Design a binder for this molecule. Structure first.
Ligand SMILES: [Ca+2]
Length: 240
C-alpha cells in the first residue's frame, strides 16, 4: 500500500497473509480475505504458480510473532476456470483456498462480510485497501499491515480513455487514481473494504496496477469485483 498508514492492530480481522515456502523459510506473497473458517478468497494470479502455501490469520507484524496469529496450510486451490494467467485484463482474477484446518474465530480473526450478488457502488464511494505490499513503487514490503483510503472510480469513468480504457471490464472495481495512494505488489489478493450502510464489506480483490508504477494518476488500482462472483463463490464452497 502506497500512501497509507499503519492499521490499528487487528482492526481488519478478516485480512490474511498468503505465504509460500522458500527452502526452510516462509515469505509473504499476497493478501486474502477469510470468508469461512476454512476458506480464503484471494486472486487467481497469486496462486497459479506451483508453490507450497500457507495462510496466516490474525497477523499484524510480518516479522514478529504477536501471539494473535494462527498458521494453517492450504488443502485445495480453486482458481476460477476462466482465469488466464497471460491476460489479467480479461478478468476472472479470483481463487478460493480451502484451508487444512478450520481457524478459531476471535477478536483478531473474523470472517469478512461479502456484498450481495450484483451490488454496485456509486462513484467516489468510501473504501480502504489493506495489505503488506510495497509502500512505494519498486520499494519494500511493509512490516506492519497498512491501510489507505481509496474511493471508488465507477466503471464508466474508469473505462474511459482518460483512465484505463478497455483494459477494465465491468467485472472489476477501480479505486484511487489520485497519484498518491494505491495498492502495490504484495497487496494483490487482499481486500478493498467499502462502507455500505455503516458496515464494511469486501467489495474487491486486489488484481493489478499500471506497468508504470503503483500510484499513477488516473490509473486507479484495479480489483476483481466480488459482487460479480457471489454465485461462483457459493457454488465452490457448496461443492468442495
Ligand atoms: Ca506477526
Amino acid at each position: 500500500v502506497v500512501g497509507g498508514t499503519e492499521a490499528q492492530r487487528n482492526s481488519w480481522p478478516s485480512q490474511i497473509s498468503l505465504q509460500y515456502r522458500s527452502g526452510s523459510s516462509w515469505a509473504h506473497t499476497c493478501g486474502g480475505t477469510l470468508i469461512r473458517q476454512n476458506w480464503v478468497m484471494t486472486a487467481a494470479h497469486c496462486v497459479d504458480r506451483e508453490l507450497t502455501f500457507r495462510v496466516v490469520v490474525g497477523e499484524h507484524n510480518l516479522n514478529q510473532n504477536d501471539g494473535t496469529e494462527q498458521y494453517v496450510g492450504v488443502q485445495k486451490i480453486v482458481v476460477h476456470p476462466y482465469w488466464n494467467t497471460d491476460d489479467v485484463a480479461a478478468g476472472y482474477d479470483i481463487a478460493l483456498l480451502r484451508l487444512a484446518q478450520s481457524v478459531t474465530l476471535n477478536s483478531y480473526v473474523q470472517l469478512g462480510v461479502l456484498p450481495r450478488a450484483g451490488t454496485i457502488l456509486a462513484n467516489n464511494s468510501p473504501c480502504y485497501i489493506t495489505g503488506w505490499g510495497l509502500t512505494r513503487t519498486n520499494g519494500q514490503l511493509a512490516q506492519t499491515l497498512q491501510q489507505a483510503y481509496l474511493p471508488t472510480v465507477d466503471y464508466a469513468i474508469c473505462s474511459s480513455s482518460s483512465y484505463w480504457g478497455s483494459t477494465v471490464k465491468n467485472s472489476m472495481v477501480c479505486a484511487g487514481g489520485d497519484g498518491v495512494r494505491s495498492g502495490c505488489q504484495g497487496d494483490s489478493g487482499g481486500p478493498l473494504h467499502c462502507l455500505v450502510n455503516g458496515q464494511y464489506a469486501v467489495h474487491g480483490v486486489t488484481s493489478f496496477v499500471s506497468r508504470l508504477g503503483c500510484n499513477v494518476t488516473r490509473k486507479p488500482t484495479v480489483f476483481t469485483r466480488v459482487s460479480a462472483y457471489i454465485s461462483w463463490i457459493n457454488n465452490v464452497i457448496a461443492s468442495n
